[PDB]
Amino acid sequence: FSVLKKLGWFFKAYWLRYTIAIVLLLAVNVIEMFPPKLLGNAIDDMKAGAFTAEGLLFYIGIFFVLTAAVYIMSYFWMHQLFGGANLMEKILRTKLMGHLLTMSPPFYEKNRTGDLMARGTNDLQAVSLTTGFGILTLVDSTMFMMTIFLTMGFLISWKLTFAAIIPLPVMAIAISLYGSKIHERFTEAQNAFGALNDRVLESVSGVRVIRAYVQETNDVRRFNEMTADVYQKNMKVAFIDSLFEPTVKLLVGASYLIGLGYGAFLVFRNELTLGELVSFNVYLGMMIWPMFAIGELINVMQRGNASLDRVNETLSYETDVTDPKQPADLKEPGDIVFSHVSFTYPSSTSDNLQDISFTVRKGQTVGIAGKTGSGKTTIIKQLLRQYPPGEGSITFSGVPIQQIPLDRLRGWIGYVPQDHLLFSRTVKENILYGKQDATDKEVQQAIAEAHFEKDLHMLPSGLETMVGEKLSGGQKQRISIARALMANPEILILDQSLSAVDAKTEAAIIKNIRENRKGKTTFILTHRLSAVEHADLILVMDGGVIAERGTHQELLANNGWYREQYERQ
Amino acid sequence: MKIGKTLWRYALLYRKLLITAVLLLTVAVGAELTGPFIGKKMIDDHILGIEKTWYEAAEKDKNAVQFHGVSYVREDRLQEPVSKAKEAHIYQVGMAFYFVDQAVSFDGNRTVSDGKLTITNGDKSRAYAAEKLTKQELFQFYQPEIKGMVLLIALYGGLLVFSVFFQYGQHYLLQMSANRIIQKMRQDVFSHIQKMPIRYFDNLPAGKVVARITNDTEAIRDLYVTVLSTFVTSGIYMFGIFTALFLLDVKLAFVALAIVPIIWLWSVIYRRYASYYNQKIRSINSDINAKMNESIQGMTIIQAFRHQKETMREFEELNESHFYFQNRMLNLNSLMSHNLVNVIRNLAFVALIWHFGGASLNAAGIVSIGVLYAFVDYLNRLFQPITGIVNQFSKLELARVSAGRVFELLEEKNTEEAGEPAKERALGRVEFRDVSFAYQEGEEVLKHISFTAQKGETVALVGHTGSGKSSILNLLFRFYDAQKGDVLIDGKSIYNMSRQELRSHMGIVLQDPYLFSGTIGSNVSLDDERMTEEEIKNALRQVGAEPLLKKLPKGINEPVIEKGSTLSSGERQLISFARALAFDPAILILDQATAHIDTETEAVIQKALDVVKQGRTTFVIAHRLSTIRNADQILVLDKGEIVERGNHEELMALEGQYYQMYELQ
Ligand SMILES: CCOc1ccc(-c2nc3ccc(-c4nc5ccc(N6CCN(C)CC6)cc5[nH]4)cc3[nH]2)cc1
Ligand SMILES: Nc1ncnc2c1ncn2[C@@H]1O[C@H](COP(=O)(O)OP(=O)(O)OP(=O)(O)O)[C@@H](O)[C@H]1O
Ligand SMILES: Nc1ncnc2c1ncn2[C@@H]1O[C@H](COP(=O)(O)OP(=O)(O)OP(=O)(O)O)[C@@H](O)[C@H]1O
Ligand SMILES: [Mg+2]
């Protein structure tokens, strides 16, 4: 097993507690080997002539002392080891979340949400189990069994030990074999149950069509057939799942019978004693567990190896797609100029942007138009440092963005995406997201600026309601707009944020925002060309290039490009 | 509704398997538990038999052992050819055995100094001449018992294999009973789901209903496996153990019986603490997973707004609470569970030592080490299932609540009783007499809706959202009762025929054409199997390009395993149309509402509607107000009311709502 090799850092950080756990485990094992021998000695003293009240009292007292010592030391070594397990789990959760927070859209393009959730909910469990439970099974399968075997060999006898320990290895091997073939059948049965669940989901979601063709009878026939198949798979599992108790019972009772009969024969030959026979029986009883522990260790350590490999691959080797470099000395962006920038998404070969160049003065207002898929939002995505910078130069006041720190850049940009992104927090929290709780009065002023306060009033004032579990596309868009506004950004980007509200509402909002943000840059992306009529700069994006460049008047003068011919369709 | 009553009711079915499993378990337990009794007879009658009196007898006698030149035979094998003639003993001092060739009355502390065994017993008794038995002579006192030893060893193994076979049988039969009970429960649950009204499905996410039908049934299966394989099995195992304990020695049997209260109190306390800790841990872990999900989704705004620090702080707060409660659970498991099992085991050892030491001190010859060995083995068997029992008892609650949910579903009363397919064609005439439909109560979604659709097809129900267009579809199929007025098909009230009879007359096409997983032919036929390879109805729908791409949709192509995602948006509608045409319904209802019509494909849909609308009575809820320019009877729904009962041309002449919704498109 290389898991303990891949987790050297954890044990190095926590070595005192694991050292205490291991030492206390060895001590507990040693002082737990005593009580059976004391029982045998008591039996021998009973049979032998000399046995006075002093012996009885001493045996009772020593048994109580050993019981208390084993109890305390067991509590504390389990505390150390399983606390290490919990600490490893918590550390892995923290590390995984901290790594995710610093990742970029490309990483999630490569890595699906389902896989990432699985790693953070199962692989952590497996690794933590390895750190705590793997170590317990390693000590009990390697130290406890060897200690109990050596004690039986020396204190009791060697012939009796070897004879009585023949079936336990067979029991362990058979247990592992059953584990493998029950795991296989269990996977089969779980797949069958998944098929059942999928069919039930189909039959329940599409209940209208099923009912509309009086097919609710054929549906039940198929469901019953699939339940019958599930029953067959479960019975196949139970076939090998019912071989465990018979096997352990047989190969432990055989071990007890060998011990008892052979010990009786040795007693006949004076090579043993009744007390030692009873001690041998107790030692076998306490030795049956190390057999299971071997297989449990192998299983847990292999699973932990796989889980830790996956976690490390999706936690460390992944390199952040965007990073700061040589921080500049720019406080407020003067102008934003694109100079023949070309950028292609990491997951595609088409350029999607061909030598785009333009300027945006401080306070300049830019509108973007174009058909769906015509690189409309890519122009601002390239400005959010979400993807590799490609080729060209995007210089804020004359210096490329790479020099600007990511923190400062993200501070300048107030970004409203076309997609609705809200969290399971009250609207107050969704709007406050921008300013991270610097003030509360500004909420009223910001919501008035977005002109959304009226739709805030008719919703119940239950801490501005709840979002993320329920309500309206327009209301979500206005909440996002207020969130981006309240931050007081020096470059405010809106991406189709007004495609859901009416023409009058969007017109009023754009008028108000243009009036309020006089010395600040604003980017507007919207298919409604009537919503950027007042923008001092407007451009239309087709493919990777710009079809034309000029003010609204220039576009009006040029050929009819989806200006008003589509009003009222 | 009582969960226990319903579970017992479902278990009473298949009682043959349960009874057989119980009997097989009883026999296996009897064999296994009589094993240690065989061991205690072995130790006492045979190894310790030497401690019994010996009487001289002739060498002719069987089971006679020569000591020096004189043959003795034990009190158990003794017969009455000679009354006593002798009284010899084989006493034990230290690790040596001493032959006493004299009658001894008392017994006690034995001492040998100069070949004069003396038993004190607080009386000094007498000094008896004693001779060390060496090892060969001593073994010659055990050869008579070697054969009984071998015989008892053999009996042990036979009963062991017997118990093995019966253990396998009982475990398998318990598993079979659990699985079959759960299969019957699932059958009942789905059959009931087929009878629940559409209100139930509408007012409850599909995933929740599916989980109730499937997941909760698995929870009940786990509950059955727990009750049988843990509580019944352990109950019988411990009843047999206590029977054996009482048969061995009653005095210690009562003491051992005095641990059942120890199990009950332990179970109650551990349940109390572990249920709380598990509830908190599960809730916090659900919160952690939800946070991770809502952070991975929507991470763009988290990063763009520099919220990484705050989200990390919230996640760490949840993580610290989770760590706290996991450590508390570990603390409880350390103070209880295996540690307490070992403590009780050592207490049992001490109790045995105390009892047998008190017995031996009185020197009444009642040490009975065989009873001690059997008690050790039995008590050791009795402490195995304690941890499993307490864990399962704590865990019962989740399966109990799952069973409550499943039986709440089953015990639903408002269910539809139907199942009569129609025996005659509809003739295509559907009429409404001032129907007034209210979903919840009081609030009306349709007010005195009244219209008649002759055999001529293409009746259009078009209006602005919230006008109750799809409610008519619900009324037609009797998904929801009208609550007023009436609906007639061919003059027959829709509320005077079985829902199955009514829905046989009509076919449905919806906005999201359902594409059941399977073959295209089975999806078009709804795996009915009651129709032949007539899926050339699909071709009649003008699907001439899709079915030649690969294999054949007529039960030969299986691309629908992807929920229709890969197939074009228009092609799914073109499969649903084929399904509607295959069943040949008299009345076709077509609920179409798609702003993103996906042009360059919707054309075929129109073509499809020309092939299916003919020779029926078709209701078209389509939007866009352009596919219904040939509707025989247009209808405009406003505020749940037919405000303009007109035609494509008549409505245009009269202007109004339809004119506005046509000019603005
Ligand atoms: C993170 C997870 O942490 C865990 C840590 C430990 C365990 C654990 N699993 C165990 C399984 C068995 C035993 C066990 N210890 C025993 C001691 C004696 C006996 N016997 C057999 C019966 N009689 C006849 C003799 C004595 C059985 C025994 N079984 C202990 C165990 N401890 C599980 C999870
Ligand atoms: N996840 C992605 N993987 C690959 N290419 C993508 C991805 N998302 C978008 N694109 C590319 O982006 C092109 C269009 O750019 P983008 O989607 O940013 O703007 P748009 O669609 O024109 O306008 P809007 O995005 O506002 O609808 C698409 O045609 C596609 O080639
Ligand atoms: N199962 C239901 N229970 C209660 N009210 C419902 C139910 N289904 C729909 N409604 C409501 O009843 C009214 C009727 O709307 P209907 O279902 O006919 O859709 P519509 O108004 O035709 O248009 P659209 O489907 O585009 O929303 C609406 O207020 C709708 O939200
Ligand atoms: Mg509608």
DSSP for B29-77, written as a single string: HHHHHHHHHHHHHIIIIIIGGGGS-EEE--TTSSS-EESSS-EEEETTT
Domain of residue B544, CATH code: 3.40.50.300
Short-list A408, A360, A308, A411, CA closest to A536: A360
With a CB cutoff of 8 Å and minimum separation 6, the contacts of A76 are A20, A24
Ligand 3 center from residue B645 Cα (angstroms): 21
**Structural domain of residue A63, as residue ranges?**
1-328
Q: How far apart are CA B665 and CA B650, in angstroms?
A: 18
**Ligand 1 pocket check for A136: Cβ under 6 Å:** yes
DSSP A532: G
B312 to chain A, any CB pair closer than 8 A? The answer is yes
Q: Is the separation of the CB atoms in A66 and A35 below 8 Å?
A: yes
**B376: Cβ contacts below 8 Å, ≥ 6 apart:** A39, A278, A281, A282, B348, B349, B352
Ligand 3 atom closest to the CA of B471, numbered from 1: 18
- Burial of B514 (C-beta count, 10 Å sphere; 0-12/13-18/19+): buried
Q: Calculate the alpha carbon distances from B407 to B10, B178, B195, B330 in Å.
A: 11, 17, 15, 35
Q: Does the beta carbon of A499 lie inside 6 Å of ligand 2?
A: no
Q: Which residues pair with B430 in a beta bridge?
A: B453, B489
Please state, in angstroms and as integers, the Cα–Cα distance from residue B113 to each residue in B36, B141, B510, following that order: 39, 24, 108
A311: tokens are 């976690």
* Residue A434 CB burial class (10 angstroms; 0-12, 13-18, ≥19): buried
Which residue reads 């007004």 in tokens? A498
Structure-token match 């060895």, residue found: A26
Q: Are residues A318 and A373 located together in one domain of the fold?
A: no
User: Please, where are the H alpha helices in B232-259?
Assistant: 233-248, 250-257
Domain co-membership, A267 together with A358: no
Nearest CA to ligand 3 atom 3: B439
Give CA–CA dist B384/B388, Å, rounded.
Answer: 8
- C-beta atoms surrounding A307 within 10 Å: 23
How far out from the chain centre does Cα B509 lie?
A: 38
Closest by CA position to A289, among listed A129, A78, A148, A157:
A148
By the CB < 8 Å criterion, does B294 face chain A?
yes
- The size of chain B, in residues, is 665
E strands, A299-372, where? Answer: 336-342, 356-360, 365-369
Ligand (nearest to CA of B469): 3
Q: DSSP character for B550?
A: S
> Do A244 and A367 fall into the same domain?
no
3-state secondary structure of A525: strand
The answer to whether residues A434 and A486 touch, using CB atoms and an 8 Å cutoff, is: yes
CA A492, A495, A498, A503 dihedral sign is positive
Calpha distance B293→B291 (Å, rounded):
5
DSSP string, A224-281: HHHHHHHHHHHHHHHHHHTSHHHHHHHHHHHHHHHHHHHHHHHHHTTSS-HHHHHHHH
Spatial distance between the Cα atoms of A564 and A529, rounded to a whole number of angstroms: 8
| CB-count burial class (<10 Å; 0-12, 13-18, 19+) for A214 | buried
Kindly state whether B210 is in contact with chain A, defined as any CB-CB distance less than 8 angstroms: yes
The answer to whether residues A569 and B664 touch, using CB atoms and an 8 Å cutoff, is yes
How many Å apart are CA B295 and CA A423, to the nearest integer? 8
State the method.
Answer: cryo-EM
Q: Rounded distance, CA A295 to CA A137, Å?
A: 9
Beta strand A413-416 pairing with A491-495 = parallel
Q: How many angstroms separate the CA atoms of A259 and A146, rounded?
A: 18
**Number of residues written out for chain A:** 569
Tell if the CB–CB gap between A208 and B421 is shorter than 8 Å: no
**What is the distance in angstroms between the Cα of B441 and the nearest Cα belonging to chain A?**
23
Structural contact between residues A245 and A125, judged by C-beta atoms closer than 8 angstroms: no
Q: Which amino acid is at A133?
A: F
Assign A145 to helix, strand or coil. Answer: helix
Using CA of residue B314, residue B318, residue B321, residue B327, what is the dihedral sign?
negative
Q: What is the dihedral of CA B335, A58, A275, B34, to 10 degrees?
A: -50
Cα separation of the two ends of chain A: 69
B388 CB-contact burial (10 Å; exposed 0-12 / middle 13-18 / buried 19+): middle
Rounded to whole angstroms, the Cα distance separating B545 from B542 reads 8
Mutate to test the pocket of ligand 2, among A352, A495, A541, A546 (most ligand atoms within 8 A of CB): A352
Helices and strands in chain B: count of H runs, count of E runs = 23, 20
Angstrom distances, CA of residue B80 to CA of B61, B101, B537: 11, 20, 104
Q: Around A396, how many Cα atoms within 13 Å sit in the side-chain half-sphere? A: 20
Asked if B621 and B539 touch (Cβ cutoff 8 Å), the reply is no
Chain B residues 472-501 with CB within 8 Å of chain A: 477, 479, 499-500
Instruction: Return the half-sphere exposure (C-beta side, CA atoms, 13 A cut-off) of residue A14.
Output: 19
B375 touches chain A (CB under 8 A): no
- List all residues 6 or more positions away from A544 whose beta carbon is below 8 Å from its beta carbon: A342, A351, A352, A353, A354, A356, A375
Domain count, chain A: 2
How far is B235 from B226, CA to CA, in rounded Å? 12
Please give the angle made by the CA atoms of B309, B312 and B315, to the nearest 5 degrees. 155
Of residues A43, A198, A436, nearest to B372 (C-beta): A43
B contact test, residue of A24, A237, A270 with most B CBs within 10 A: A270
Instruction: Supply A550's token pair.
Output: 């000029």
Domain of residue B599, residue span: 430-664
Which candidate, B542, B533, B508, B514, places its Cα nearest to that of B619? B508
- Cα(A498)–Cα(A510) distance, rounded to whole angstroms? 9
C-alpha distances in angstroms, B577 versus B267, B301, B469, B535, B541? 62, 43, 20, 11, 7
Collect contacts of A236-240 with beta carbons under 8 A, ≥24 apart. A236/A185, A236/A188, A236/A189, A237/A182, A237/A185, A237/A186, A237/A188, A237/A189, A238/B171, A238/B172, A238/B175, A238/B176, A238/B179, A239/A185, A239/B172, A240/A178, A240/A181, A240/A182, A240/A185
First vs last C-alpha separation in chain B: 56
- Cα four-point dihedral sign B506, B508, B514, B519: positive
- Partners of A400 in the β-ladder: A395
Contact A204, B206 (CB under 8 A): yes
**Beta carbons within 8 Å of A554's beta carbon, 6+ residues apart:** A548
CA distance B505 to B585: 5
Residue of B nearest to A87 (CA): B323
- The two structure tokens encoding residue A462: 């239950």
Mutate to test the pocket of ligand 2, among A345, A356, A379, A546 (most ligand atoms within 8 A of CB): A345
Look at strands A491-495 and A521-525 and give their pairing: parallel
Pseudo-torsion of CA A59, A60, A61, A63, nearest 10°?
80
Q: In angstroms, rounded to a whole number, what is the distance separating the alpha carbons of residues A385 and B304?
A: 9
Torsion angles phi and psi, residue B50, rounded to 5: -55, -30
If one counts every other C-beta atom within 10 angstroms of the C-beta of residue B229, the result is 21
Strands (E), B84-138: 89-93, 96-100, 110-111, 116-119, 127-132
What gap in Å lies between CA B214 and CA B182, rounded to an integer? 10
Helix-then-strand count for chain A, H and E: 24, 10
Q: Are residues A319 and A335 in the same domain?
A: no
Cβ neighbours of B532 (radius 10 Å)? 8
Q: Are strands B116-119 and B110-111 parallel, antiparallel or unpaired?
A: antiparallel
Cβ of residue A523 lying under 6 Å from some atom of ligand 2: no
Instruction: Give the closest residue to B422 by CA, choosing from B508, B500, B529.
Output: B500
Going by the DSSP 8-state scheme, the letter that residue B88 receives in this structure is: B
Ramachandran sector of residue A363 (left: φ over 0; alpha: ψ -120 to 50; beta: rest):
left
Helix/strand/coil for A357: strand
Do A161 and A80 have their domain in common? yes
A114 lies in the same domain as A177: yes
Contact indicator for A144, A29 with CB cutoff of 8 Å: yes
Contact B295 A101 (CB under 8 A): yes
Number of alpha carbons in the 13 Å side-chain half-sphere of residue A293: 19
CA dihedral A385, A390, A396, A397 (to 10 degrees): 170
Q: Are residues A322 and A338 in the same domain?
A: no
CA distance A482 to A456: 12
